[PDB]
Assembly symmetry: D2
Homo-oligomer: 283 residues x 4
Amino acid sequence: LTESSTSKFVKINEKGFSDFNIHYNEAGNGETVIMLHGGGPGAGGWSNYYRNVGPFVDAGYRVILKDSPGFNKSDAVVMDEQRGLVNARAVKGLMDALDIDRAHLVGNSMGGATALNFALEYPDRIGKLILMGPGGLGPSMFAPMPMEGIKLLFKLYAEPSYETLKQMLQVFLYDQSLITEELLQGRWEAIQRQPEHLKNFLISAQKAPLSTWDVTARLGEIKAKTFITWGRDDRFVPLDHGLKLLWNIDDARLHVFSKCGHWAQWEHADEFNRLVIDFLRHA
Amino acid sequence: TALTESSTSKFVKINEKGFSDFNIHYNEAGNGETVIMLHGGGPGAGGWSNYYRNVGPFVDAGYRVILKDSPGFNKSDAVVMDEQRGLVNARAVKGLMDALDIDRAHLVGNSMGGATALNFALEYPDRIGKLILMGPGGLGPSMFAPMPMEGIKLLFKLYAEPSYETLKQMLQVFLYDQSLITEELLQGRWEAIQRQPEHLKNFLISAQKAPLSTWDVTARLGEIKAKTFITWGRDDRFVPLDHGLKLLWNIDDARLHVFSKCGHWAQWEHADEFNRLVIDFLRHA
Amino acid sequence: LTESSTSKFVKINEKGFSDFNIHYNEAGNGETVIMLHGGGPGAGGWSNYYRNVGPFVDAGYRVILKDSPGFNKSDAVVMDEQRGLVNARAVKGLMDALDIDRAHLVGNSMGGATALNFALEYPDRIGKLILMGPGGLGPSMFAPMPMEGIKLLFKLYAEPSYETLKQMLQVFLYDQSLITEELLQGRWEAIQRQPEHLKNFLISAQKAPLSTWDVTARLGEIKAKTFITWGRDDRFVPLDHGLKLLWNIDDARLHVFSKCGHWAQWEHADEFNRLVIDFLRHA
Amino acid sequence: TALTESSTSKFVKINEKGFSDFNIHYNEAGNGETVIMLHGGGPGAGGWSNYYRNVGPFVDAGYRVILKDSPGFNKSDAVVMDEQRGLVNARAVKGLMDALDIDRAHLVGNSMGGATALNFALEYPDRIGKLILMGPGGLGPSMFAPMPMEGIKLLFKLYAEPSYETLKQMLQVFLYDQSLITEELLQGRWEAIQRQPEHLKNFLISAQKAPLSTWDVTARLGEIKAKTFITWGRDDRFVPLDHGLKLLWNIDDARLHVFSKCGHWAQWEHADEFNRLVIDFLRHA
C-alpha cells in the first residue's frame, strides 16, 4: 500500500459544510475503522497512520485515514467553534456521502477530541472508540499548562520554520534518534506546501480557544467501548487525562507505553497495532 | 488427562537460603516456556484459588504453567519468617526451579506474589524471562490513598479473627462487582483457612518480625531489566493504583494496563481480558 | 462561649423555603463568617466548629455556626435537588432575614458543597471562600468510590447504631485516641434525638444522588478568594479533589495537614485557626 | 545600619568533610533564632538573589537570618565535587554553623537548597530546628511529569552555553507570570554568571561525576523528625508538584502548601504570602 494508491477524495454536506471536499486514504474490506490525525502543522491521515494502515487492513478491516477540515489535502476552512465538534460533523458527512452506518474511530490528539465529540453527537454511528493522547480535556491536575508541546505547536503555526519544526519533533518523540533528515525535511515540505492552513488554524484558535474543547462534562454519556492509550513521556497532553477518561467513560481501559512520546501509534506501532486489533476483534 | 485441581497437584522438596527439604505444593500443566504464577497474601490464598481462571488458557497457548503455593500458604509447609516475605518467597521460587531443572521462567505475581516476583527479578536476573505484575504489594506509601487501605485492614482482621463472614467482607472489598462472589469460591477459601490454621498464626508472628514496610524494594526498581507488564484494577481497594505508575516510571522496560470496573483481582474479575493481554505480551513483547 | 449562650433561631424565605426555621450559634462582632457543617448523622453547627468559634470571634469576627436544613435544631426537610444548591439558598435566606450583605464562608464536606454553590449562585453576597474537604466534586482520579467514609455514612443513616457510629468515627479521625466515650455517647444521643432527619436525608438521597452535586463544570465562575484545606488521611473525600479545586478556581491555595482525617478544623484546630484567620485578615 | 546586600555581606572559613579553610560567602542580619536560607542550583544563583524579598521580613519578625552561598556558587569558593551536591552542601552548612558557634538552625531550602536541607536534617538531626522546603530537587522521578522537566533542560543548557537570552528563557519558564521578570533581576544574575564562569564549568564536571540521580534521598525520608513545612508553586515547570506529596507522605511531621499562579520560586513570586506562612510556622508550629 502507498499514499497515492490509497489517495481518494469526496465532497460532504453537514451543518457548517456545503460541498466541502475531504481527502483520505482507503484500503481493505470489512468493518470500517476511521483514523483521525492530530492538530500539528502538516498533520494528515497517511502521514500519521502509515504504520498502522497495513496491519489493520490485513486484520480484515476497511481502513480510512481521514484528513480533517483545514488539514493536508482537505479544503481549507476557518472555524468559529471548537474543532473537536466541527471535525466530528465532517466525519459524519464523510460516512454519509460514502454510505457508512457504523465506524470504529481511532484518534490522536485533535483526532481524539474529534472522536469524543462524534461519540457524543452521533452515538448510533460509532462502533468502538480508540483514543491516543486525545486533546481538549481541560486542565491537568499535575502539569502546568500550556504544556511544552503545545507551546511549540502554536509557535510553529505562527512562525513556521525548519528550526522550530525540529524542536517540536524533539519534544514530540521520546527516542531522539528517530528524528531523521528524511522525517524532518518530509514534514517540512508538507507545512510549506499549504500555508493557508497554518493561518486559518490560528484564526480558528482566536474564535475558539482550547477551553471550548473540554467535553469532560459529557463523558458520562459515551457508551461505546473505549480503549485509551498514552505515552508515558507525552509532553503535549497530560498523562492524568488518561485516568480522567478511565474514570468517566463507563466502559474503558487504559494502556500506557513507557519510553513513548505523543505519537504512540508510530513510536510503538507494533504493540499499538496488536493491542487495538485485539481490542476490535475481542472486546 | 483432564485438567483439574487434583490432576495438576504436585509437590517438590526445595533447598535454598532458609530452606532445607522444605515441601512446596504446586499445580502444573502444559509444556513449553515456563510461566510460574505467584499468589497473594490473604488468609487462605493458594495457587489454584488465585489462578484457576488462567491456567487453562495459558496451557492452551503453549506454556508450561506452574501455580505455586508460597511457604506458609495452602498446601506448602508451614513457616514463621523473620525476613521480608517477598525475598524469602523468591528464594523458594528459585529452590523450586532448581529442583525441577527449570533454567528460566516468566513470572506472574499478584499482591504478595508481585512483591515476590520483583524480589526474584532483582536477586536472580538470569533466571527470569518476562515479568508480569498484578497489583503488587509492599511498594511503600501511596501518594493519594490513606493507609492502611480497606483491603489491608480486612486482611489483617481475617488473619487475627478468622470467620466466614469476615472472609466474605474481605472478598467483597477486593471486587468491583461484589455480586460475582460465589458460594464455591468462599467455601474453598474458607476451607483453606480452617484446615491450615497455623498459617494464619504464623503469618502474624512473621509480620511482627518483618513489617510490611520491609517489603518495599522501590529503591532497587532501576535494576530490573526484564521486560515488564504491569496490570491493575481501576477499583483496587487493597493496593493503590498510583503504585502502577511508580512501577511504570522506575522499571526500565514496562507498560501499564488498567482495567475499569475491576477490583484487586484483574486476573480473576477480568480473566478473559487478562489472559489475552498477558499471553500476547509473552508471545510478542 | 457556650452552646446555649450562642443558641439562636430565625425563620427564612427562599425558592423552596417558606417560613422555615433555621437554628444557629452566634458570637462576636465585625465581618461575618458563616461556618457550614458536614452531612454526617448528628452533624451540626456548634458540634463541628466549637473549637474554631472562640479564636475567630477574638480575631474580631462575627461568627455564625449555621445548621443546614434537615440537620440538628433546624426544621426537618426532604430535598428533590442536590443539597449543595438547596443549602446555599438556605444560607442566603438566613443572611436576608438577618440583613447581611456580605459573608465569609467556611464549609466542610456537605458544607463545602454548600459554600461552592453559594459562590456560584450569589457571588455578590460572598466574601472569601474557605473549603475543608468539600463534597460533591465528582469521581476521584485515584480513589475507588464510594469511599470508605461514605459507605459508613450511609450505613449509619440507614441503620443507626452505637457500633456503626464508632466505626464511622474511627475512619473519620486519623488519631484513634481522640475517640473518647464522651465524644461517642455525645453524638450518639444527637442522632437518636431527631431520627426524622435520618430518614429524610435518605429520601433526599433517593431524589438527588451525589452525582447531582458535582459542580466541577462551574468552578471557573467563582472569583472569590479561596482557601482549600484537606486532611492527608481523609477517607471520606479524595485528596485529589484538592488539586481539582486548586486548578479550576481562579484564585485559590491548598493546604494539606498530615496525620489528619475528615475533621481538619477539629483535629488540627490550632493550625487551622491560625491559617484561616491569617487568610481572612491578609489575603 | 541599613539592610542592603553590601551591609549584610560577610565571609567565613569552614572546615568539615571535604573542606579545609574553604571560604563561604553569606548575607546576614538580625538576632534571635537562626534561620539559614539555602539557594537553588541554576547558573548565577546566590543567597541574596534568591532571598532578597524574604530577609527583611524574617529579620523584622525576630530571627537571625543567614543567606548562604553554597560551595561553587556566587561569592563562595570554587569546587569540583565528586559526591552528590546535597550532601556536600550540607557538610558546608554544618561547617558554617560550627565556625559561627551556632548550635541549631531552622533551614529554608529552594531546589538544590532543598536537597541540601534534607541531607542536613538526615546527617545532623541535633543541629536543625524546623525544616522548610520550597520545591526541593533531586527526589527522583515524577509520577506524572516527563523528565527532564522544562526548567531542568534550560538549567543545563545555560550551564553549557551561558547567554543573556537563555538566562531570560530559563527565568521565564520558572515563573507563572513571566511579565514579573525585571531588567535588574536579569542583570544581577547575568553578572553572577559572567563574573564567575568557572562555577558553570565546575558544576558540569561535577554533574558528570555525580548525576542528579545520586541526589535522591527518598529512601531515608522516614528518618527526619524535624517539623517540616513543604511549599510548592502549582505551576512549577522545574521540579514536579507530586514530589510535594511524596514529602508529605514520607516525612513524619509535615504539612504542604501549594500556591496558585506561582512558578518554581514561591519565595519570590509570592513573597508576602510565603513570608507570612513560614514565619507563622516557625513561631507557632
